[PDB]
Design a protein around this ligand. Structure first.
Ligand SMILES: Nc1ncnc2c1ncn2[C@@H]1O[C@@H]2COP(=O)(O)O[C@@H]3[C@H](O)[C@@H](COP(=O)(O)O[C@H]2[C@H]1O)O[C@H]3n1ccc(=O)[nH]c1=O
Lengths: 173, 173
């Protein structure tokens, strides 16, 4: 069970606590319809993470990239952190724009269930996705780096509309 | 104990199995002293991972970067994977040149031990570092992506010379 726990702490230490302090400055640079101030992280509990989000939903299209963030990390000179800006559609209309991406460790949970050596049952994929979201929420609720700049979007599919799911959180702000 | 196990599986799923198939073609492009054909991964058991490798050792200097590897990953368009080429010195002489980097999850192990919320004891970071190397070694031995293109350098330091440690693995090949 500690797998999803460590991945959530990994996700915060080696990513969120590094890019969240510099995000609002990157969004301001791109603006100068404006882009929302927060980073919206998609958390599909089925751990189904497509690499191309524009084709995953017709009402979600890639718009542009943010200016890249670079830094020396673990002996890698100028390791690049890049983020994408997406437009959310509603009845053929641009309803909102924001920085949108999936939580990558959910891909790791999915692949571990496929591998036999990983000791990770296929049935345990849902509860680890749940534990990943609970641990990540606990971290961000007490995170100094998280100051109204990060919004988690967790959902479960059984019709469901992903673009309508993101627009709900976007309008709440 | 399952924390380091999941970080090692993450390290292979979301990184090693993505860049190792492309590494030899990237090293050849740079060559056209030649650079070695394997990715050399430093595994300090004390989990002390500096971000600037050149500062850590006077006999290890940064030389150049490889051509960047990009790809759409989890909704992030053109996510960048970059690797650095280092030169290793011995008595004021260039003794070797290779692609060298630390295993970043060891930084995650170090940071979890300092956070109280992580449920990770200070004393347990050497134990988790040993499990991370053991799990990663088991994966790469059975990894089809790893075909004698990856070399792990685990070491425990109480004098110790890191550049001398890397050269030993280089000269075996
Ligand atoms: N540019 C980015 N775009 C979107 N997400 C990012 C980015 N950077 C970090 N993250 C998240 O942060 C997590 C932990 O990052 P990390 O601590 O660096 O350790 C990585 C992990 O243990 C394992 C799997 O990778 P994942 O991507 O699945 O997990 C990371 C992302 O979830 O391979 C490690 N690894 C990956 C690549 C690299 O270049 N060197 C490196 O060492």
């Amino acid at each position: 069970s500690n797998v999803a726990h460590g991945l959530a702490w990994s996700y915060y230490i080696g990513y969120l606590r590094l890019i969240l302090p510099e995000l609002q400055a990157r969004i301001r640079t791109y603006n100068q319809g404006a882009v929302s101030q927060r980073l919206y992280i998609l958390l599909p509990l089925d751990c189904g993470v497509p690499d191309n989000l524009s084709m995953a939903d017709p009402n979600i299209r890639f718009l542009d990239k943010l200016p890249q963030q670079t830094g020396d990390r673990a002996g890698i000179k100028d390791r690049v952190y890049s983020n994408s800006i997406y437009e959310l559609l509603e009845n053929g209309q641009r309803a909102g724009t924001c920085v949108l991406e999936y939580a990558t460790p959910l891909q790791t949970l999915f692949a571990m269930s496929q591998y036999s050596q990983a000791g990770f049952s296929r049935e345990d994929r849902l509860e680890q996705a749940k534990l990943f979201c609970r641990t990540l929420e606990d971290i961000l609720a007490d995170a100094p780096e998280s100051q109204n700049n990060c919004r988690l979007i967790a959902y479960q599919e059984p019709s469901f509309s992903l673009s309508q799911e993101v627009l709900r959180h976007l309008r709440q702000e």
